[PDB]
Amino acid sequence: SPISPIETVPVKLKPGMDGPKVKQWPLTEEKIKALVEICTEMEKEGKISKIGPENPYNTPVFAIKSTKWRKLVDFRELNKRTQDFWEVQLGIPHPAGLKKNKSVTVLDVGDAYFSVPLDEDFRKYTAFTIPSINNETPGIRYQYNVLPQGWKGSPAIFQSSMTKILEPFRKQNPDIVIYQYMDDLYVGSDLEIGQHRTKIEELRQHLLRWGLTTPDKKHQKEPPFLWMGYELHPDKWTVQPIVLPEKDSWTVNDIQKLVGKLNWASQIYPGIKVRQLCKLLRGTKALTEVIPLTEEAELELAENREILKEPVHGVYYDPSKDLIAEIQKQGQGQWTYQIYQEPFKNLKTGKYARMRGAHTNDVKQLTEAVQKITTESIVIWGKTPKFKLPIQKETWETWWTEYWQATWIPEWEFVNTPPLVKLWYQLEKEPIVGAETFYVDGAANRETKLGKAGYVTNRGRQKVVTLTDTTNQKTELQAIYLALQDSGLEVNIVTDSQYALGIIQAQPDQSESELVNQIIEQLIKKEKVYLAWVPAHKGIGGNEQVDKLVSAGIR
Amino acid sequence: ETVPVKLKPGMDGPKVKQWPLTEEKIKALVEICTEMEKEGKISKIGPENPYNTPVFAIKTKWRKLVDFRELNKRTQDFWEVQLGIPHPAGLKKNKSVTVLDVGDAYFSVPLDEDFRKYTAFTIPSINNETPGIRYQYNVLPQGWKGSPAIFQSSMTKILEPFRKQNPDIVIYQYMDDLYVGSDLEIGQHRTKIEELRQHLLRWGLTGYELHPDKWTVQPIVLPEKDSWTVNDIQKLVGKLNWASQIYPGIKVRQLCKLLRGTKALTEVIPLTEEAELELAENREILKEPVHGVYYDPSKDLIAEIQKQGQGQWTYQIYQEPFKNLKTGKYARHTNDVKQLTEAVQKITTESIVIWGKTPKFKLPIQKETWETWWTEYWQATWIPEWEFVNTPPLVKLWYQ
Ligand SMILES: Cc1ccnc2c1NC(=O)c1cccnc1N2C1CC1
Ligand SMILES: CCOC(=O)C1C(=O)N(O)c2ncccc2C1O
Ligand SMILES: [Mn+2]
Ligand SMILES: [Mn+2]
């Protein structure tokens, strides 16, 4: 097993700290014997070398079980003391971003970490001791000359070395695509099943020249490749087999495992839903507690089963074509999407269902799903897709201009796939002449938690309800709600709550507050609503009236 | 020649993740970086360097912008209370101020050996197909605040004869930029700039034009109208009530006396005379600067920006809320983000001109949206600090 002629990577320890000095626990005789067999074998290969107790450092060893042993070194203390390293990656490729190729080959590196050397000045800190039968003799002491299993820096340095090894070959084979992943290499090209086989062996030679053994023609894996939960053919890809078990009883754990599988499947299976299954996990219980399935959850499971009926795959990326992203409202809070280049041959699918803030509408949700997909596309393809959205340009146009937040959807086009996205009500810009002007206000006593909500109008009317466990904010929303309840199809409402105005002004059509949803229910039933704000306690006609009317016995 | 630099005691170097970049920006950066490496400005690095600082490409020739905001915080003591560049109070009073990208100077000066590791940055690959290309600076980097602090003595030398020949010319160095301001006539000013570019050219360096004397306030204009309606006077008092929290002397009482008893909004009510007495006396106060508001150099600046629609944007600079150091506006294919990024830069330059630091921005935008799009329109050599916020729906109309 070759030990590679690479340059070395200068490793240090975390500033101020000295190397580990953890005592070796005495082991059993079969364990001590097994370690000697292993260590002397590694010694002859150059993997480890003998030292003496002049070297002050120690890391414990162990042996586990089969009819032969493996040696385990617990580098916990050295790992705590070794410097921080650059991350071994910033992200993992999505199959959907891979170019299509005629041939693709897997080469795993023979004995990964042990093939690459360790910095001389750090080798001393990897010292371990094989002890004698009891207290007895001083033990046999070794240090590593190669990257050790389970050591903090081995991942990064091995990967660093591999990049440097491939560099020349890459630059003299520009139309050859290679991907490093742990102790694997995936190599693809567009040349025929003849000179492609040739080109692998040129690479294998380049690797053996740098002390890395890779399987030959007869021993290398065949397509499709299982990788990180994918199946990868040279021209298509899909997620690995999803199987939703039919159970009499569903435990939290089962539902959790189901949701995870569905979430995973959703990368390529269109229309996957998980809201109803997820709902069950809220404010939960033990892993083993049986959750009775909700009717809507049962409906969701059946739908998902149906979608996963027959296998579906994804295609690979073509750099010469644009990307098309299509998005659909799947129900409440749920949004589903597909990305393709050629009509309906998907590169990948996906779902969005987030809840950005308490109160939202479909136009806000739709544009948030657009940003999520936009980021994703940059990561996977290095460009933004053309969007096709279930919303009218004018519906969108209207929302953007009037809204206080800045927004930007890249190039898109309307597509008539119901449900279509629309606003459900709109507040007037001008107060309605010949409509009843409600002045609303709330009040809440902070210690008691009691409150009053009410209104006085320009037409003499006057109501005041009492509420028991409340906050000022809730009372204002209640007061505004009252004004809508007893007003009919055309109303002016003046409030002194910016909080309240803020929520309503941004046309929400769903909330995490039941009260706010009641207000929405009322606002749609209306025909013309004007809402306006006045400052609290500045001698305003109707405002001072309701305030005194709700402040009766409360403040 | 390398002057020793180190971090502020206790804190360690930056570990900031790199943002996803588009195909073209990555390609642009690979070209930019292959060159800088040949010329020895930067060198490839190994995994032994755990540090990272984001990198972007901006604008006809693509150019590299490094986000050193994080590093700057962790070396603050160095560029501020060791080799701080003094700010001249005259710069804002000048009739014309030209801004010159002088940042190419820094490549001639080598960087402290032991410090080079903290300037680590990464060029990532599309779909993470290949490991990121890792680099570190061997010379003073652009966008790092330590750079002009170190270069200050070389800069003083370069500018010595020009300063001697033009005593009435204000030259302020902020970052990669030199702020040159004069009270001359425009033709003479633009000539003195070209004259200065020749001084710079003899050392290896290489315009954008401001008029800070013509930065009059944004007075909160109160409406004038014939036959006010109940609604209009309510909007009027709300604006005044708020204005009295900042401006001393703002009276409000007489207006509300006209609003007594539960009345309808559309009902037109006649205006008395005590209204116009207070109104005009209010207008009088709003058009002047804030009395009692002064800049504390040890307090962070904050800027708020409100979307106004019709391609309009109002903004306010302050350290303590409502205590406005300056208010303003911004006029307008042109989208929200494009305009917002342009406004931010405008406001930031004005801030640098007036106080010599960038304000922390409160941005009326979604985090993700801003992060994906801001580089498309960004043009400056610096990056200010930003937060993302909900513009109070009433702050909007107040400054409108
Ligand atoms: C796991 C993986 C991740 C990144 N890229 C690839 C692979 N492996 C493939 O199976 C593969 C298949 C299709 C296209 N490129 C692929 N490759 C490219 C390298 C030839
Ligand atoms: C904290 C109490 O202050 C008040 O006097 C206030 C009050 O009565 N009401 O109704 C009120 N209503 C909305 C906003 C703010 C206030 C107030 O400050
Ligand atoms: Mn109130
Ligand atoms: Mn009140």
Curated annotation (Swiss-Prot), chain A:
Substituting L208W results in: Confers resistance to zidovudine
Q: Per the record, where is site Essential for RT p66/p51 heterodimerization? A: W399, W412
User: What result follows from mutating E45D?
Assistant: Confers resistance to zidovudine
Q: What is the effect of changing I133L?
A: Confers resistance to delavirdine, efavirenz and nevirapine
* Effect listed in the UniProt record for changing L212F: Confers resistance to ph-AZT and zidovudine
Impact of changing P223H on the protein? Confers resistance to efavirenz, emivirine, HBY 097 and quinoxaline
The RNase H type-1 domain covers which part of the protein? Answer: 432-555
**In UniProt terms, what is the effect of altering K68E?**
Confers resistance to adefovir and lamivudine
State how changing V187I affects the protein, per the record: Confers resistance to HBY 097
Q: What is the effect of changing K68S?
A: Confers resistance to didanosine and stavudine
Location(s), subcellular: Virion
The record describes its quaternary structure and partners as: Heterodimer of p66 RT and p51 RT (RT p66/p51). Heterodimerization of RT is essential for DNA polymerase activity. The overall folding of the subdomains is similar in p66 RT and p51 RT but the spatial arrangements of the subdomains are dramatically different.
Protein's UniProt name: Reverse transcriptase/ribonuclease H
Shown segment, full-protein numbering = 588 to 1144 of 1435
